[model samples]
Target: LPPGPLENSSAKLVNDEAHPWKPLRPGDIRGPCPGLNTLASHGYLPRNGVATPAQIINAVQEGFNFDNQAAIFATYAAHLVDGNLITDLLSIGRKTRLTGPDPPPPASVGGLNEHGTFEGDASMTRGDAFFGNNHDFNETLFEQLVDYSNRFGGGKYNLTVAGELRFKRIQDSIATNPNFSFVDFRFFTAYGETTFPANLFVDGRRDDGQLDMDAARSFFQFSRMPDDFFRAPSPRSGTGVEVVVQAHPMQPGRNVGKINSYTVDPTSSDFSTPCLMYEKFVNITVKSLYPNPTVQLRKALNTNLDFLFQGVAAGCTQVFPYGR
Candidate 1:
């Protein structure tokens, strides 16, 4: 079984000597997630960008001071859908045999690079999939982020900047991309990601949660942590996502079969609360993807799902889709 939450959640030096910054080597994979990429580059996660569910859980918790529920929900959800459960491996970037082979059809081990799974539309730095590449960082989008920070946050990338830029990015996608999709999981992740920089990227020694542009560029452009960085003051629950959502006031839904035709989906997991999100993700999303899975897959899913539920255990009831 994977390890439980960190007992001591205080801020600490993350860019320590044991995990020095390194340049990307040949065949190394990076994905749409700058946080994960930063972790990989700094040696918190495997440098080659391939990892297991347990490794990711540990990496986020240790390196970024993410709370138990936040770490497990993000890691296992990505692993269950995009990871190769049979091999217990997941690629951070493009699909490769490195994470092992596919697990039958309809069930893809496509890694985090592919859109419409764990990665989705309206990312902070990455472009939409319809425009060509969705994984690499985009300069134009980042410049817009800079501009928003200047205007809304007085040059600091804080919650004020996050709220404005997040909505603007959504509007930009709707106007340009015809195949824009921001349904259930995508909607949930987009806002969560929007809050990450403000909460996690700041040097923890400083009291303000505002992010420095230099650190932001380091993570977003180079997938590198700023020198002498520290983890957050404590484990950050994913609650900040809803705080950003309330400030912006956007519902969880996507375009109805076409761009500009938006519709709300209340049945989808609600980001308003963490437990509700956990319930829907387990009972609906994971189950929908692996209905009647084989024994090996079932055992693997059951173990990982239980690990995920453990993070949300205080408030949520654990559900074993497969027998306990």
Candidate 2:
């Protein structure tokens, strides 16, 4: 189990002398998520970019001041789909032998680089999987991010820029990528991620929530935090994600047949229904991947599934694939 936070509401200098930012060396894995990458580069999570679910939860809480629920939700959700549950290890980026041996066929311990799972299409700074290289940062997309900040955010990345860019990225994917996908958990996280920089990357001493564009570039392009960066003032959750979603209000959908043939998924979980997301993720997504599991696998699955379900609000039933 992940430990509780030592201090949940106090601000601290996260990029202190102890955790100075370092350039990546050979075999230092990175991924589409700038938050996790920054944590790795600054020695928050394992510098090698591989860690257990408990370590990730602890890192986010200690280094970034993430609330308990947010840390658990993000960690276990990514772990169940992209991690090796048997070994209790997850790769920050691509799959590697470092995360332990294979979990057998049909159960891909592909890590966060596996698209259409935890990592999905229409990322803010990365291209879709169909265009090749979905995890690496794209310069053109980063430029677009800067341009939108300049045009809409008064030279800062704020909620307004988040809304516009979030909508534009969807349109860009729909019009261009024939195999674009923005359904399921991707749809939910798209808004949450768009607001993370504004909410989490700013210096805690600064009362205003605007994010510096230079800091944003450092995080996205190089996976490094700005020199002397401080963590958030208090424990921050995905509270502002709904504001970004409300500003643009995109429906959860994906292209069906072609580039412009998007179809809304009635069954997709929206921001209002976290309970439904919990149900679908456990009973449908994870269950289908490991239908008949080994004794060890079943035990691990049950434990992780309980952790995932605990992050959701009350009234959601926990389903066990193997009887307790």
Candidate 3:
């Protein structure tokens, strides 16, 4: 993580005392680092290297600031794409049927047609229509693509593209709708706590000094927080804290085989047919981009700028847990 501007300044102050040979600032108007100046003079650097260190530092800082800002914007855009995918998939699932209507109860059994029985329905009709005679229909390439896209690493490029698209959308939206809040910085310093499943291993003897395998097994089922459970106190006050909640999409694990096995197996089957597996794949193919630290900082800075322009008191501070 890069230090905030204030921290950078403090570091520079410390560095100045230790390196008397080094200039207070680089002589070049555009190169922030002394190394960059050397590289530029040799024609290995960009033309911008002619600038002073202060100018170069400001430029580099601004570049990072913008990158973070873009990331924040992209995160919001990803959410919208996520919502659209969900909506589309839901509609498809509802419209597709998997089974045929049941044949009228055996004519011999008083011809009592039971309503809502698995014997016949839209789902069954659809299933039979689609899966009845053809194995190809069950294993369509499109279906496989859908499955691959939804699984871990299979559709990573597509998911990343979607994330990028989302970011672009956020940028576009902010440009067009200037009034919309651009970023939320407080979230950067706000620590989140979550409990995850854990497997514990323990070995001990029973009260009578006998080996306690059963007791050890029982102990393995529980969990406890480590000594340093809570995050350290935030350096900045809570005033004007802005929090934005977004989802971080993870690559879904391989689900096609799992879904097919579950749906086709008699004992394990939950779905009525294989097409249901296709539907499941489509539903999970979407991805999200959220919970980005850069975005949080950008939003905070944006808010701070807004306050400053309005002649209101505002300040921004970032806090880091010691270990993190």
Candidate 4:
């Protein structure tokens, strides 16, 4: 291949249109493009003409409404170990409260404890009233993903700022085709307190104020899962590491948008050498604290992913490619 594309591929794509996907004000849900049947116009509502980016978000409201606590946290947490987000930290919550209680929308999503939480590496939950760690969402979400993907690239500061990315849309149709790249297991955490609403638990510790059943369900349901979900393991052909499994000591590492080729010994006394893919992914970590569709949250990070598939992020728009 021609080496790899440059960093900011997602950023550049969102900003490349006649208009562009501009950063919303403290709490604006519209995009920045303007034209007839244009990219930004379509982006505002890619699916069934959802009125606002916020509305497009409303599509996944069912997820957070259910009551499956463990399934919720287990699904989201597994991604960390898979993505090498071991030492990374993210805190996602309400960016701004248009109409809510004193503390704000995030803290008072349901009651005081229904807020987001602090996610450490391995999906370890230290959920507080404020949280927005490594994660992804689709909507007028081009900017949201581009914003967080950078954080996971480099641990300390703004390291992903200068990274390059490739834009891909797997199929023409957004609804059925699906998205790419990114997951895992060992999801067992007490959400916040020893006693919480969901009434879900593990090792006797119920999920504290960490994850809501609905929000957790929505993230995966509306999400554009990666190829790994379908791809079978063949040992030699190619192994995709979209989601990393959980770990305690220093188990297997998170994919961290790196390494696609590898070898192991099922035949005993033999191990295939590990190798890197031809094209290195920019800064796409696995999944993170993705609130429900309508629940807009604070910003966070991504690592190793080189490009973002707009179609996959959210199908409600036609601006960039759809699925990849």
Best model per TM-score: 2
Return the lDDT, model 2, position 319.
71
lDDT of 2: 0.84
lDDT of every model, 2 decimals: 0.83, 0.84, 0.21, 0.20
lDDT of 4 by residue, 149-233 (tens): 4343231111121111111110111112221111111111111111111111100122222323233222222322111111111
Error of 1 at 211 (Å): 0.7
Which whole-number lDDT from 0 to 100 does residue 224 have in model 2? Answer: 84
TM-scores for every predicted model: 0.92, 0.96, 0.13, 0.20
The segments of candidate 1 whose C-alpha lies over 4 angstroms from its true place after superposition are 272-276
Clashing pairs in 2: none
Q: Write the per-residue lDDT of candidate 3 for residues 1-324, one digit (tens) a residue.
A: 122232231111111222122221332222111222222332232332332222322322222121222222222212111111111111001112111221121211101011111111111001111123211112242233233334522332132222332333233323333222211111111101000001111111111211122222221111111222211111111121111112232111111222221111222212123232222212221111112224443343233223222221122232211111
The better-scoring model by lDDT among 1 and 4 is 1
Worst ten in a row by lDDT for model 4:
231-240
**Best model number under lDDT:** 2
Q: What ranking emerges by TM-score with the best candidate at the front?
A: 2, 1, 4, 3
Q: Compared with the true structure, what per-residue lDDT tens digits does model 2 show for residues 1-324?
A: 856655557887888888878888899999888988988998988888999999898888877777788788888989998899888999989998998887776888888998877888778899988899989999999999999999999989988889899999999999998887787788888878888888887888883668878998999998887888878888886667766787778778889859998888889987677677777877788887788888898899889988887776547777765677
